[PDB]
Each structure stands twice: as structure tokens, then as C-alpha cells.
Amino acid sequence: SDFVVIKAVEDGVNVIGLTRGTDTKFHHSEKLDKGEVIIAQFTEHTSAIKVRGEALIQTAYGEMK
Amino acid sequence: SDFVVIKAVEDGVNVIGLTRGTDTKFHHSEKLDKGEVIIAQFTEHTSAIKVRGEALIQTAYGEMK
Amino acid sequence: SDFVVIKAVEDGVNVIGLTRGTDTKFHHSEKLDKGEVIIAQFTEHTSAIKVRGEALIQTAYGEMK
Amino acid sequence: SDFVVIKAVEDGVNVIGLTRGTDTKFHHSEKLDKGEVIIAQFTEHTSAIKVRGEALIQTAYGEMK
Amino acid sequence: SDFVVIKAVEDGVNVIGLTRGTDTKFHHSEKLDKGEVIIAQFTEHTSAIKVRGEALIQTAYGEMK
Amino acid sequence: SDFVVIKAVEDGVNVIGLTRGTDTKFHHSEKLDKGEVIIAQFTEHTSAIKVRGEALIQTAYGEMK
Amino acid sequence: SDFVVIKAVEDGVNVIGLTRGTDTKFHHSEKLDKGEVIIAQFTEHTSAIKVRGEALIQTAYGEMK
Amino acid sequence: SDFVVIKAVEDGVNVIGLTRGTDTKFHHSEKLDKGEVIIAQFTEHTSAIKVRGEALIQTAYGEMK
Amino acid sequence: SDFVVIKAVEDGVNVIGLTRGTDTKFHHSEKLDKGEVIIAQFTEHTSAIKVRGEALIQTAYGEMK
Amino acid sequence: SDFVVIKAVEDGVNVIGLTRGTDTKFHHSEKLDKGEVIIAQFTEHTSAIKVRGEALIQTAYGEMK
Amino acid sequence: SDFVVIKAVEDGVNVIGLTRGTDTKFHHSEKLDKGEVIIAQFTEHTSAIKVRGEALIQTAYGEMK
Amino acid sequence: SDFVVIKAVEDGVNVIGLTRGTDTKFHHSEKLDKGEVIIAQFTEHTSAIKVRGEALIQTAYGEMK
Ligand SMILES: N[C@@H](Cc1c[nH]c2ccccc12)C(=O)O
Ligand SMILES: N[C@@H](Cc1c[nH]c2ccccc12)C(=O)O
Ligand SMILES: N[C@@H](Cc1c[nH]c2ccccc12)C(=O)O
Ligand SMILES: N[C@@H](Cc1c[nH]c2ccccc12)C(=O)O
Ligand SMILES: N[C@@H](Cc1c[nH]c2ccccc12)C(=O)O
Ligand SMILES: N[C@@H](Cc1c[nH]c2ccccc12)C(=O)O
Ligand SMILES: N[C@@H](Cc1c[nH]c2ccccc12)C(=O)O
Ligand SMILES: N[C@@H](Cc1c[nH]c2ccccc12)C(=O)O
Ligand SMILES: N[C@@H](Cc1c[nH]c2ccccc12)C(=O)O
Ligand SMILES: N[C@@H](Cc1c[nH]c2ccccc12)C(=O)O
Ligand SMILES: N[C@@H](Cc1c[nH]c2ccccc12)C(=O)O
Ligand SMILES: N[C@@H](Cc1c[nH]c2ccccc12)C(=O)O
Ligand SMILES: N[C@@H](Cc1c[nH]c2ccccc12)C(=O)O
Ligand SMILES: N[C@@H](Cc1c[nH]c2ccccc12)C(=O)O
Ligand SMILES: N[C@@H](Cc1c[nH]c2ccccc12)C(=O)O
Ligand SMILES: N[C@@H](Cc1c[nH]c2ccccc12)C(=O)O
Ligand SMILES: N[C@@H](Cc1c[nH]c2ccccc12)C(=O)O
Ligand SMILES: N[C@@H](Cc1c[nH]c2ccccc12)C(=O)O
Ligand SMILES: N[C@@H](Cc1c[nH]c2ccccc12)C(=O)O
Ligand SMILES: N[C@@H](Cc1c[nH]c2ccccc12)C(=O)O
Ligand SMILES: N[C@@H](Cc1c[nH]c2ccccc12)C(=O)O
Ligand SMILES: N[C@@H](Cc1c[nH]c2ccccc12)C(=O)O
Ligand SMILES: N[C@@H](Cc1c[nH]c2ccccc12)C(=O)O
Ligand SMILES: N[C@@H](Cc1c[nH]c2ccccc12)C(=O)O
């Protein structure tokens, strides 16, 4: 399954999972400080991912700075 | 499934999910402040995505600035 | 499934879904103001998409300007 | 499924769906004025598409000017 | 399924569908005037396509002028 | 399925289908005059194709001149 | 299924089908005179093809002169 | 399945597996000293991976430094 | 299935099929005179092919002169 | 399945298999002397691989020196 | 299935099949004199191939000289 | 299935198969003298391969000298 790579360029970046289904709610958040990385899949329960704060993002479609 | 990457260049960007099926309405709007990103899939419930406001958008077919 | 990316270059763009099946009718029209984007799939209900107004379009086959 | 992208270069372009099956009949027509686009799939009902008038056409096999 | 793109360079181009099966005959002829285009699939009923008249032809294997 | 594109460079080209199975016989011969094209699939019935006369041929493997 | 393209560079080229199975026998031959072409598949009954005489041969692996 | 390659550039890197499902918890943290590498898959149990500390990361989408 | 293309550069080339299964023996030898070609598949009965004599050989992995 | 190639540049490299499943522990350590190589798959039992010591590592995503 | 191409550069090359399964034994050795080629698949019975003597080898991963 | 190509650059190279499953044991070794090659698959029984001694190794991921 598809995934995203998220690296914090500054402290306090939040990576938020949004629920799959008829409803769209916050189900989990991970905080990244500068330099920390999360590699996160889309899953049965997560169909959208929100990132708050300055991050470097890589997906199958390229880089989002 | 396919997805889209949307980064807000200005405050107040709305990323809107439109319902899959015979009927079409907005089922969710995620508001992004400047710099925030959403990576969102097409899903059982979402078959079109509308973006209002100045955003950087990436899909399987490249970039839309 | 395949999808199309449509960006309005000027106010008053309409993105129209045509019904899949023996009958062909417009089932939904989405208005886009300048700068707004819709990323829309072909679906069980939609097998053709009509775009009226000045728009930038991307598909698997490239760009229409 | 495969699809075609058709943009009218002049007013009065007609995009015509032809029936799949033993018989080949016109089952629907869409008119495009200058700059208007249709993105249309081949489907259960449609196995050939006819275009009358000056149009820019894109398919999986390239551009037909 | 595979398809062919045929554009008439002169009036009176005929695009002819030949029947799939043990027997081979012409089940349909679509006449194209100059500039008109047909995008036609191979199908349950059509396993060969004949073009008479001056036409620009595109397939999966490139162009035929 | 795989197909062949055949264009007659002179009058009197014949495109001949050979029967699939234990037995091999000509089941159909299509005459092509100069400039005429046939796009023909391999099928349940046809597992080899013979071309007589001066023709331009395209397949998945390239061009024969 | 895979196929081969065979063009006679001289008169009297023979293209011979060999049987699939425990036994390897000649089951059919086609004669090509100069310029004539056969496009022939491997099939349920043919698992090897022999060519006698000067021919230009194209397969998925390239050209054999 | 998809995997990640993580190399510690300094001592004290932690590679953390997050649980797949409705709940998201850290189920394992692997410490890496300078120069040590982990190559870790996404799995039935693990649907996101967090990396803390200065690390070189490679995925299908390229490198993070 | 995969195949090999073998052209005799000299008279007396032998193309030998070796049996698939626990036991290995030659089940067929096809003798090629200069210029003759065999295009031969791997099959239910043939899992290795031996060529004796000077031949030009092409496979999925390129040429062997 | 995916695999990794690991070559020891110094004596005492350990290649460690981590268990697939809810629990994570080290089920095997292969010690490599200088120049020795292990080519190791991900498997039913191994879903992460840890390398301690100076090694040259290759995976589907390139080299890690 | 995958295969290997082996050409003897000097007399006395041996191509040896090793048995698939819990046990590993030589089940067949084919001698190749200078210039002779074997194209051999991996099979139900053969899961490793040993080549002794000076040989040119081609596989999906390239050439060994 | 995936395979590896191993050529001995010096005498006395040992290629060792390690068992698939909960246990990781050596089940077979092949010795290669200078210039000798083994092409070995991963299999039901073998999920890791160890090489002792100076060898040239090729896999799907490139060359390991
Ligand atoms: N338990 C979550 C873990 C997860 C995966 N991707 C995420 C993105 C954001 C937050 C959490 C996650 C899930 O399986 O869906
Ligand atoms: N619950 C929504 C979440 C979602 C996915 N993609 C979206 C695009 C826009 C808005 C919401 C979404 C869904 O599963 O469909
Ligand atoms: N990328 C996957 C995510 C996924 C995993 N399991 C799922 C089950 C149902 C729907 C989606 C999923 C998909 O869109 O398919
Ligand atoms: N409810 C519509 C939403 C949609 C998808 N693509 C579209 C294109 C145009 C208009 C509406 C749509 C559907 O699932 O089919
Ligand atoms: N791209 C997928 C989206 C999707 C995921 N799960 C679905 C379930 C039903 C319909 C569509 C979906 C599709 O068109 O199929
Ligand atoms: N491009 C898809 C559209 C689609 C999604 N779900 C469907 C269900 C039925 C028919 C078509 C669809 C297709 O042609 O298959
Ligand atoms: N109802 C038509 C819609 C359509 C798709 N492609 C077309 C091309 C031309 C005209 C109509 C169409 C169908 O499903 O087949
Ligand atoms: N009814 C025809 C339509 C058609 C498709 N391709 C064609 C080519 C030529 C003529 C007609 C056709 C069919 O389904 O087969
Ligand atoms: N390109 C598709 C067109 C198609 C869509 N839905 C279909 C249903 C039946 C037959 C054909 C189709 C095909 O020929 O396969
Ligand atoms: N009825 C023939 C039509 C055909 C397809 N390819 C051909 C090539 C040559 C001659 C006839 C054909 C068939 O289905 O097989
Ligand atoms: N290219 C397709 C054409 C096709 C569509 N629907 C079919 C139904 C039966 C036979 C052929 C077809 C094929 O050879 O299969
Ligand atoms: N190229 C196809 C031709 C084909 C279409 N339908 C078939 C049915 C049976 C045998 C062959 C066919 C094949 O070799 O398979
Ligand atoms: N009836 C033969 C036709 C054929 C296909 N490929 C060939 C090559 C050589 C000779 C005959 C053939 C068959 O189906 O097998
Ligand atoms: N009857 C043999 C024909 C054959 C195919 N490939 C070969 C290679 C060598 C010799 C004979 C063959 C078979 O089906 O297997
Ligand atoms: N990348 C795989 C991970 C995986 C392996 N086995 C699984 C079983 C269930 C769910 C996920 C998995 C996936 O998303 O599918
Ligand atoms: N190239 C095909 C030829 C083929 C068609 N039908 C077959 C039936 C059995 C064996 C082979 C075939 C193959 O090797 O599979
Ligand atoms: N009977 C052997 C033939 C064979 C295939 N590849 C080989 C490599 C070496 C020796 C023999 C073979 C088998 O089917 O497995
Ligand atoms: N390349 C095919 C050869 C093959 C065709 N038909 C077969 C039947 C049984 C075994 C092998 C075959 C394979 O290894 O599978
Ligand atoms: N037992 C864990 C091992 C694992 C795989 N990938 C990981 C990433 C981080 C931490 C642990 C792991 C699992 O199968 O899921
Ligand atoms: N890469 C494979 C590893 C694997 C092999 N056999 C397995 C059995 C069960 C689970 C995983 C595996 C996978 O994730 O699927
Ligand atoms: N490369 C093939 C070899 C093979 C052919 N037939 C087989 C039957 C059983 C096991 C292996 C095979 C594989 O690993 O699958
Ligand atoms: N009998 C062993 C043969 C083998 C394949 N690859 C190997 C690598 C090393 C040693 C032995 C092997 C097996 O099937 O697994
Ligand atoms: N018995 C182990 C062998 C193994 C494969 N990959 C490994 C990586 C590290 C250590 C051991 C292994 C297994 O099948 O999983
Ligand atoms: N690369 C193969 C190895 C393999 C061959 N045969 C197998 C049987 C069972 C498990 C693994 C295999 C895989 O992991 O899929």
C-alpha cells in the first residue's frame, strides 16, 4: 500500500491521521521535532494524513518542500 | 488507491471531499492554514476532491501550481 | 480508476459529470472560480466529464491548455 | 478503462457515442464550443467515438491535431 | 481493449468493422468527411478494422501516414 | 490481444488469415488497394497472418518496409 | 501470446510449424516469395518455428537478419 | 511489501514501530548506534515507522538526509 | 512462454531439446543448414535447449555471437 | 519476496533477523568475517533485518555505504 | 520461469543441475565443447545451476565473463 | 523466483544455503574454484545464502564486487 515520508524541518511538526469511512475525524497525532521522520502508510483505518508545521514530504509523486 | 498531495500557500485553503455514488455533495471540508499539507486518497466514500484557495497540488500526473 | 485534474484559469468554469449506462444525462455540475481545482475520478456513475470555461486540464495523457 | 480527451478548437464540434454490440448506432451526442473539453471513456455501452469539427484529441497513443 | 484513432484527411474515408469469428464480413462502415475522427475499439464483434481513403492513423504501435 | 497494422503501398495487396488449430488453411483473404489499411488482431480463429504484395507493416516489434 | 514476423528477402523462403508436445514433427509449411510476410504466433499446437531461406526476422528480442 | 532502510549517522537513533489498526501505539523501539542499519518492512502489525536521531533513510521514493 | 532465436552461420548446426522433469535426455534434434533459423519455446516438454555448431543466438537477455 | 545483500568490510559484522508478528525479538544472528556476504530474504518469520558493523548493503532502493 | 544462457569458451565446460527440495544433489551434468551453448531454465526439479570451466554466462542480471 | 549469480574470483569459495523457517541452519554447501559459477534461487527450503571467499556477485539489485 502507498505511504508518505515526512521529515520535520523545524520542531513541533504534527502528523495527523484522519479516519477512513463516511466520517472524517482525527484518530491519532505524532509530533516530530527537527530532523525526526515518520514513514506512514494509508491503511484500513487511515485514508488521509494532515501535516502541520514545516516538513519535507516525499511520496510516489515526488517531493513537497 | 490514487491520492493527491495538497499544500496551502495561504491561510484558509479548503480541501473538500465529494461523495461517491449517484448523488454528489460535500461530506467533509478540511481547512488548511499556510504551509499545512494534506495527503488524501480516493476512497469508497470520496470520488472527487475540490480545492479552494491558493495551493500547491501534486498527483500521479504531475504538479499543478 | 483513472481521474482528471481541472484548474479554473478564469471564474465561471463548470465541471459536469455524465451518467454511465445506456442513458446519458448530466447528473452533477460543479462550479469552479478562478484558481480552484477539482480532481475527479471516473466512477460507477460517471463515465464522461465535460468542462466548460477556460481551464487547465491534466490527465494520464498529459496537459490541455 | 481507456478514455479520450477532446477539446474543441472551433465552435460547434460534436462528439458522438456509437453503440457496443452487433449494431452500430449513435446513442448520444455532446456539442462543444471553442475551448470546451470532454473526457470520455469507452464503456459497456460505447465502443467507438466519432468527432465532427476541428478538435484537439489526446489518447494513450498521443496527440491528434 | 486496444483501439485505433483515424482522422480523415479527405472526404469519403470509410472505416469498416470486420466480424470476429469463423466467418469474416463487413458489419459496419462509418463514412468520415475531411477532418472527422473515429476512435474505435476492438470488441466482442470487431476483430479487424479496414480503412479506405486518405487518413491519419494512430495505434499502440505509432503512426501510419 | 496482439494485432498487426498493414498498409498497401501499391494495388493488389492481400492480407490472409490462417486458421488456429491442428489444421492450417486460409479462411479469409482481404484485398487492399494502394493507401488502404487493415488493423487486424490475432483471435480465437486466426493465429497467423500472411501478407502478399508491397505493404508497410507495423507490429509490437516495430516496422517492416 | 508471442509471435514472430518473417519477411522473405529472396524467393522460396519456407516457414515451417513444428508440433507442441512429446513429439516434434512438421505440421504445416508456408512459402514466401520475395517481399511477402508472415506474422505467426506460438499456439496450442505450434511451439517451434523453422525458417528456410534468406529472411528478415523480428521478434520480441529484436531483429535477426 | 514496502520497506524502509535506516542507517544511524550518530549514536542514539531509535526506530519505532507503530501498531496497525484503530489504535496507534509504539510496539517496539530498536536502538541503532552509529553506522548500524535496519531494513524494516511494513507488516500486518506495523503500518507506520518513526525515526528519531540523525539517520540516513532510503525508501521507494528516494533518500532522506 | 520464453523462447530463443537460433540462426545457423554454418551447415550442420544442431538445436537439441532436453526433457523437462526428474530425468534429462535429448528428445529432439533439429539440424540447421547455413542461414536457417529456428525460433523455439520452452514448453511442458522442453526445459533446456542445447546448440551445437556456430550459431547466432538471441534471447530475452540479448545476443550471443 | 524482497531481499538484501550484505557484505562485511571488517570482521565481526552481525546480520540479525527480527521476528515477524506482534512481538519483536532477534531469532538469529549470522556473523560475517571480512569479505563474506549474506543475501537474505524477508520471509514468513523475518520482517526486519539489523546489521551491526561496517558493511556494504544493497537493496531494491540502491546502495548504503 | 527464469533461465540462464551458458556458452563454452573452451572445451570441457560442465553445466550441472542441482535438485530442488530439502536435499541437494547433482541430477544432471551437461558437457559443452568450445562454442556450444545451453539455455537452461529453473524448473520444478532444478533450483540451482553450477558451471565449471571457462564460460560466458548471461542472466536477467547481465553478463559474467 | 529471485536468484543470485556467484562467480569465484579465487579458489575455495563456499556458497552456503540457510534454511527457511523458524530455524536458521546450514543445509548445503557448494565449493567453487576460480572462475566457477553458481546461479542459485531462493526456494521453499532456502531463504538466505551465505558466501565465504572472494566472489563476484550479481543480483536483481546490481553487482557486489
Ligand atoms: N494505527 C494506524 C497507524 C497509522 C498508519 N498511518 C498513519 C498516519 C497517521 C497516523 C497514524 C497512522 C493505522 O493503522 O491506520
Ligand atoms: N473519511 C474520508 C476521508 C477522506 C479521504 N480523502 C478525502 C478527501 C477529502 C476529504 C476527506 C477525505 C474517506 O475515507 O473518504
Ligand atoms: N492504499 C490502500 C489502503 C488500504 C489498506 N487496506 C484497505 C482496506 C480497505 C480499503 C483501503 C485499504 C487502498 O487504498 O486500498
Ligand atoms: N457522485 C459522483 C462524484 C463525481 C466523481 N467524478 C465526477 C465528475 C463530475 C461530477 C461528479 C463526479 C460519482 O461518484 O460519480
Ligand atoms: N481508486 C479506488 C477508490 C476506492 C477505494 N475503495 C473503494 C471501494 C469502492 C469503490 C471505490 C474505492 C477505486 O476507484 O476503486
Ligand atoms: N474507471 C473505472 C470506473 C469505475 C469505478 N467503479 C466502477 C463500477 C462499475 C463500472 C465502472 C466503475 C472503470 O471503468 O472500471
Ligand atoms: N452513458 C454513456 C456516456 C458516455 C461515455 N463515453 C461516451 C462517449 C460519447 C458519448 C457518450 C459517452 C456511456 O456510459 O457509455
Ligand atoms: N458495434 C460495434 C462498434 C465498433 C467498434 N469498433 C468498430 C470499428 C469499426 C466499425 C464499428 C466498430 C462493436 O461494438 O464492435
Ligand atoms: N476498455 C474496456 C472498455 C469497457 C469498460 N467496461 C466494459 C464492460 C464490458 C466490455 C468492455 C468494457 C474494455 O474493452 O475492456
Ligand atoms: N473473422 C476473423 C477476422 C480477422 C481477424 N484478424 C484477421 C486477419 C486476417 C483475416 C481475417 C481476420 C477472426 O475473428 O479471426
Ligand atoms: N482486445 C479484446 C477485444 C474484446 C473485447 N471484448 C471481447 C469479448 C470477447 C472476445 C474479444 C473481446 C480481446 O481480444 O479479447
Ligand atoms: N493473441 C491471443 C488471441 C486470442 C484471442 N482470443 C483467444 C481465444 C483462444 C485462443 C487464442 C485467442 C492469444 O494468443 O491468446
Ligand atoms: N494452425 C496453426 C497455424 C500457425 C500458427 N503459427 C504457425 C507457425 C507455422 C505454421 C503454422 C502456424 C496453429 O494454430 O498452430
Ligand atoms: N515438441 C517440442 C518442440 C520444441 C519446442 N522447443 C524446442 C526446442 C528444441 C527442440 C524441440 C523443441 C515441444 O513442444 O517441447
Ligand atoms: N505493505 C503491506 C503490509 C502488510 C503485509 N501483510 C499484511 C497483512 C494485512 C495488512 C497489511 C499487511 C500492506 O499494506 O498490505
Ligand atoms: N505462447 C503461449 C502459446 C500457447 C497458447 N495456448 C497454449 C496452451 C498450452 C500451452 C501453450 C500455449 C504459451 O507458451 O503459453
Ligand atoms: N530435466 C531437467 C532439465 C534441466 C533444466 N535446467 C537444467 C539445468 C541443468 C541441468 C539440467 C536442467 C529439468 O527439467 O529440471
Ligand atoms: N516457461 C514455461 C514453460 C511451460 C509451458 N507450458 C508448461 C507446462 C508445464 C511446465 C512448464 C511449461 C514455464 O516454465 O512454466
Ligand atoms: N514484529 C514486527 C517487526 C517489525 C517490522 N517492521 C518494524 C518496524 C519497526 C519496529 C518493528 C518492526 C512486525 O512484524 O511488525
Ligand atoms: N515480502 C513478503 C515476505 C513473506 C514471505 N512469505 C510470507 C508469509 C507470510 C507473511 C509474509 C511473507 C511479504 O511481506 O508478504
Ligand atoms: N522459477 C520457477 C521454477 C519452477 C517451474 N515449475 C515449478 C514447479 C514447482 C516449483 C518451482 C517451479 C519457480 O520458482 O516457480
Ligand atoms: N535443494 C536446494 C538447492 C538450492 C537452491 N538454492 C540454493 C542456495 C544454496 C544452497 C543450495 C541451494 C533448494 O531447493 O533449496
Ligand atoms: N530461517 C530464516 C532465515 C533468514 C532469512 N532472512 C534472514 C535475515 C536474517 C536472519 C535470518 C534470516 C527465515 O526463513 O526467516
Ligand atoms: N522469492 C520467492 C521464494 C520462493 C520460491 N518458492 C517458494 C515457496 C514458498 C515460499 C517462498 C518461495 C518468495 O519469497 O516468494
Author numbering:
A (entry chain F), B (entry chain A), C (entry chain B), D (entry chain C), E (entry chain D), F (entry chain E), ...: 7 to 71
Please give the exact wording used by the authors of the publication that reports this structure.
Studies on B. subtilis have shown that when TRAP is activated by bound tryptophan, it can recognize and bind specific segments of RNA. When the tryptophan concentration is high transcription attenuation occurs as TRAP, binding to the leader RNA region of the trpEDCFBA operon transcript, induces the formation of a transcription terminator hairpin thus preventing the establishment of an antiterminator structure. When the concentration of tryptophan is limiting, TRAP is inactive, which allows transcription to proceed into the structural genes.
Previously determined X-ray structures of B. subtilis and B. stearothermophilus TRAP revealed 11-subunit oligomers with essentially identical architecture. We hypothesized that the 11-mer to 12-mer switch could be induced by withdrawal of the C-terminal amino acids from the subunit-subunit interface, as observed in B. halodurans TRAP. Such a switch could be engineered by simply removing the C-terminal amino acids starting from position 72. The conformation of individual subunits is also very similar, with the main chain r.m.s. difference with the B. halodrurans TRAP (residues 8–65) of 0.38 Å and 0.33 Å, respectively, for the engineered B. stearothermophilus and B. subtilis TRAP.
